[PDB]
Design a binder for this molecule. Structure first.
Ligand code: TZD
Ligand code: TZD
Ligand code: TZD
Ligand code: CA
Ligand code: CA
Ligand code: CA
Ligand code: CA
Ligand code: CA
Ligand code: CA
Ligand code: CA
Ligand code: CA
Ligand code: CA
Ligand code: MG
Ligand code: MG
Lengths: 523, 523, 523
């Protein structure tokens, strides 16, 4: 067998059947004779390729396979890899390299020092020393991306390797099963359970790795048993809990002092599947108030090591959440009371308040909709206004890197064909990965894109104001016609200049048979 | 003085007056109080920021200054940095980092292991250990980008550094002059001159560093004195010679055997300002035929080290070209005869042959036009059909990385307001950095964009055919309306479905007062 | 031909005939059939291998070739590479890697991520992608080490590559000549010369790259013409000037304020072949006083970029020193007056003052002796007390890394068999690379080793005192018998407990036919 045939058999045997890619000459020997049981998803720029694959992997809860062109193509994707790193997304990034005979002279398209290019944004990065090693290296990449803590990996392959003979002993790779589905030993788990049972006023904080693990329902049981309020850890990449469950208390503010104040009076705070903590704004103060003990369960040694406070347990989130939820006592305390509905903001017949948009989406969208957020000034309101009952219902760029939601919404919709995806994207954010719209059109992936058009980088104008920073250039983005962009890439386009038009446009979009972009004029 | 004030004074004193950027919160303390004597050029995605800056630096023959957001923004620009590395472009890439107080906890927007992120695509990469070091680090960045061999550099700056007190001893940085304008010592230069004078059938090969140095006219004198044919080194990023001068022989094919065959019979081949050689296709054979000696003059030790044949001299291209041109004897041999004009391809009243497009551009464009090429299947024809008399007249992605020409054409036009820039970009290539069109519209930079629309990644379809590679996915890009994209970003748009319309559209574009996109239907 | 045969032919054709090594199984396919025209120099630990090679390269003014075992052997040498980096030593470090078939599984002796291991202490670091590339990679290594600024390079080679067939086109590598022997263009050089001629009170500062270039005599002519005092730049790795020439003013103190004070009143300071500056102690103040302009000539862009003051010219030191010395005018000013002899320190009949030792060495040693210094508390006195008339007469660990002088003195003595080498090494320093003594014994390289035994890390005890740092552990090294160590490795050993014995021992050592160690009891 050839390296080509052995590698595709390994991929198939390991559950991979889709290649997200943008092609190039160093990849042609890999992409030729493309197997009939595989699907190729083309995107027009590599940030878009990797964003689509990322949304696919996060929603599917399985690795996604990517194939890129050399250094330039890998490079174009590195902002996307920054997000994937922070979301623990299991991405297998392969890049075509020059033929081994031409690497030394640094022919055009040579990926120089290739394994160093994506660092520090990958778990493992490698170029094999020979063609026959390529299947083994691919095996390593699959497992490295897939073991807890999941994350992106990189493999560079010289184009002449594919046609070479494989090692027949590569067959041992095909059916390897590698597990990291582990939890704290029984003795220490009993100690933790007792501490949770003995707490007088526990709180729970959940992060994205809960949703990635589909540990959401177990965390609901845990919260119900402990009669504990539940917060989502700051800068949330995913939604780990039903947002109208009585225990839910919303998104934590991303500040040191704000979080210790919020946690004051809680004697034990159990954090599951989050860094401690993904702060953002400078908000100096105490990490915890006196009287609060924190215990973190994390899938990631790097998270456990850098927490500035608390104990930690490094384990699989699914396994730990299931064990805790089934072992804790049912507390006698009263169940927390649900948060009240948010206020309806006054809305005239002109430009839309973001609150209006989110209320309307919540009114009209299916109960199993999936939302993506890249409308950076409106996140707090979005989290208050969307009832998200189900797992997998929310994604936000985990490193704060714009250009994620537009392509990722396409990959999420590919992963979840029965669940309507609605991406709420600011006018600034929409440009970073605008060409991803074409993939939605070509493959008829029926994502709805809601462009929040306020003409500015609003979150940055806001922050300049908190700073009292004068004379800051580059904060306004006037003069973009998003309906024309949508037409450019073959996506149906609508405008919404007022609430009547927003409702009309959403109605049209929700019944459409293809992707739709709605440009919304916001305040 | 603050670090902010000292740093802007250093930039001004070192000739920097423009910041190419996409803003972000870790940059706000740098961008506030933006000096009135500086210009900010906003682009919507970082590949576009860096591409614009790259074209500006290459055309201006001076460093360009860039300011990006953290890891994600830097990451989005890394495909652009791959090209900048290969073109020796003097780019000072700065990226805003989190406040020093928040780096340890890896708050959102922390650039982790920041100095490693852009490697291996930068000459120097650094994060200062303290705020007061930032001006010195910025000095290092300026000089590292600017010394031969020029290239991109990276500096990460924590946002809290700018407001801190600077070292008063930083004033010594302001007026430093650093020269690498060096040439071979007289004894060894005399040996080289004698070898050139004694050659019976010399040839000259020129690369991009000749154009970067504005050594073009000196190379013309050299070629005239030696009565030698002149070739452009393969995979040419720039045009180093007048393309209708009698000595000019065109673009070398990017293959080992093709180049040795071309050079057969030439006893001495002098290569100036090129790698030896930027081959592309696999074309095995002899690096040189018996009877040919090669001598390379290069600004880059890495080029000299990796050449598989020939002697080398590592020196400044401007200084070496001027010395050689003034020292060699006038040979008695007959001057080479000019290449004949290329053939006119038969053209009906339907879709345009690329040859037609280039002939028409050559007919209608000003004699001092500047061309950019990202129409990958048509490069050989473009090089044959455009009379480029002047330096600075041609740019092509130096690493082969698509997404360069659209933004770079905007930066070149900003650098050369009196010279009409015409970017010839394939329909595939146009998408990589499509959002750069907005910067042309906003700043009214009157670049002309000619989109060669054949519906496919033609160069890859071609190569799959040479390979006899069947069943390759992802090679077609149907369904893109480039006039709608242009409208989306505020750029006037025209179509050309036949030759009559191409001429009409070019006439309109050439007299327009702003940027114009022409979608051309090509065969 | 095999890769083995082609590689040894390349080495021979490029002037390499000696391999400094410590063997291992991944190197056996390289070291077998060792050519009869090559010499192998074995040392017992890799710090010693690289130190010997370093002294050989620095004294010989040519690259030295090293062959080490995998990651562990490379690792053992990395302190030695820190010094080699700072001295610009042209070292070709090769390391044997596992067979390509075993790298993926990470068999014992695999050098994982090999090219990253020696970074950041090498100019270039690489592992070839195929066996046939190894000769080309070796060519790259030779030239990268040898081009200005010279320095160490690293090449990892899988053991199975050597027996494979080489590319016949590798013959083009054999006779490549690569020059970086360049100097400032004539126009700008004339500007510099005029500034030097117009100076009212010039000073000259010289660094190690002057001695490396054998530019010493040209600098003497320069100093004589300009009637200028001459200082050696701080932390001096080499001696660039005759130390009793009338212009010589000694070693600069390694402090910012001390150097600006020393330079006060000098209107133009010309620095040649040094960083600006290799300060050590924290001595804050002005980098230059008002009235002083600095101009640096450096072979290293990294030096030019980081200087905090002054103009710079990046060029070959030999070429620049020769041009300046022949172009400047003879000033009418009076030649500087020689420094007076230093004082004789009072010495009783007990333990030796270091000053006594250096005076006695100066009295008894040949006029063409070569000294090495790793007696860290006595450097200032050594520089005052040794008359070093000739180039190549002094070496000191260029990064401050102990373990250099003992092995380097063996490599210097191998390079300069007619010049008696005398290494003055503290009792602390002597241990770092003690096993290098064996190589001197085995090859009968007649280095003299003078161990300054004061029982302590004296320089650190001194510094703790300037700090008023109490309760510092680990500063004393009692209980080492250096005569027994010398016997252990087969080197003749003497003691000197007083001046009479020092003179007797030096007399014996100077007439010995092999290496000799003298343990001196110092105060
Ligand atoms: C890749 C990248 N570049 C730049 C930024 C900096 N940035 C920018 C540019 C923001 C404004 C986004 O504007 P928008 O129109 O999408 O949304 P709002 O108007 O609601 O802020 S928010 C933010 O952090 C970023 N996060 N990621
Ligand atoms: C960033 C990036 N991604 C992918 C490629 C691979 N690639 C691709 C995708 C090419 C086709 C460009 O198509 P085009 O429409 O611009 O021009 P032609 O139809 O004339 O080939 S040429 C080429 O090398 C690349 N060079 N750079
Ligand atoms: C490899 C290494 N380790 C530790 C040190 C630190 N160090 C040490 C350990 C010194 C004392 C050397 O003691 P010595 O006996 O050789 O000489 P003195 O007694 O004259 O200081 S000087 C110095 O910087 C070093 N420079 N290099
Ligand atoms: Ca409602
Ligand atoms: Ca699915
Ligand atoms: Ca906005
Ligand atoms: Ca014509
Ligand atoms: Ca200009
Ligand atoms: Ca095309
Ligand atoms: Ca004396
Ligand atoms: Ca010798
Ligand atoms: Ca001592
Ligand atoms: Mg990197
Ligand atoms: Mg290392």
């Amino acid at each position: 067998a050839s390296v080509h045939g052995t590698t595709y058999e390994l991929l198939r045997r390991q559950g991979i059947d889709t290649v997200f890619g943008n092609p190039g000459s160093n990849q042609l020997p890999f992409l030729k004779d493309f197997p009939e049981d595989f699907r190729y998803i083309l995107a027009l720029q590599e940030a878009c390729v990797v964003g689509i694959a990322d949304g696919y992997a996060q929603a599917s809860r399985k690795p996604a396979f990517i194939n890129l062109h050399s250094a330039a193509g890998t490079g174009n994707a590195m902002g996307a890899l920054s997000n994937a790193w922070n979301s623990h997304s299991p991405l297998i990034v392969t890049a075509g390299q020059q033929t081994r005979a031409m690497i030394g002279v640094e022919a055009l398209l040579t990926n120089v020092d290739a394994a160093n290019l994506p660092r520090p944004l990958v778990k493992w990065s490698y170029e094999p020393a020979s063609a026959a090693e390529v299947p083994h290296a691919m095996s390593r990449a699959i497992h490295m991306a897939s073991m807890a803590p999941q994350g992106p990996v990189y493999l560079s392959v010289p184009y002449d390797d594919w046609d070479k003979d494989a090692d027949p002993q590569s067959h041992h790779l095909f059916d390897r099963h590698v597990s990291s589905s582990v939890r704290l030993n029984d003795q220490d788990l009993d100690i933790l359970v007792k501490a949770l049972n003995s707490a007088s006023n526990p709180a729970i904080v959940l992060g994205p790795d809960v949703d990635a693990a589909n540990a959401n329902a177990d965390c609901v049981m845990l919260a119900e048993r402990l009669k504990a309020p539940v917060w989502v850890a700051p800068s949330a990449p995913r939604c780990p809990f039903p947002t109208r469950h009585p225990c839910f208390r919303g998104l934590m503010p991303a500040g040191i002092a704000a979080i210790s104040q919020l946690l004051e009076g809680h004697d034990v705070v159990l954090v599951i599947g989050a860094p401690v903590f993904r702060y953002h704004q400078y908000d100096p103060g105490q990490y915890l108030k006196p009287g609060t003990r924190l215990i973190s369960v994390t899938c990631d040694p790097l998270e456990a090591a850098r927490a500035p406070m608390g104990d930690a347990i490094v384990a699989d989130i699914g396994a730990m959440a299931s064990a805790l939820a089934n072992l804790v006592e049912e507390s006698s305390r009263q169940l927390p009371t649900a948060a009240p509905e948010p206020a309806k903001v006054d809305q005239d017949a002109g430009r839309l308040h973001p609150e209006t948009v989110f209320d309307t989406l919540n009114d009209m969208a299916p109960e199993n909709a999936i939302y993506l957020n890249e409308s950076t000034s409106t996140t707090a309101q979005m989290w208050q206004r969307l009832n998200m009952r189900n797992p997998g219902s929310y994604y936000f760029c985990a490193a704060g890197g714009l250009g994620f939601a537009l392509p990722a919404a396409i990959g999420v919709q590919l992963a979840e064909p029965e669940r309507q995806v609605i991406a709420v994207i600011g006018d600034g954010s929409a440009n970073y990965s605008i060409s991803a719209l074409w993939t939605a059109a070509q493959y008829n992936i029926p994502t709805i894109f809601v462009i929040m058009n306020n003409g500015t980088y609003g979150a940055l104008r806001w922050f300049a104001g908190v700073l009292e920073a004068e004379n800051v250039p580059g904060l306004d983005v006037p003069g973009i016609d998003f309906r024309a962009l949508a037409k450019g890439y073959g996506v149906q386009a609508l405008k919404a200049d007022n609430l009547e038009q927003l409702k009309g446009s959403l109605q049209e979009a929700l019944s459409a048979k293809g992707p739709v972009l709605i440009e919304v004029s916001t305040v």
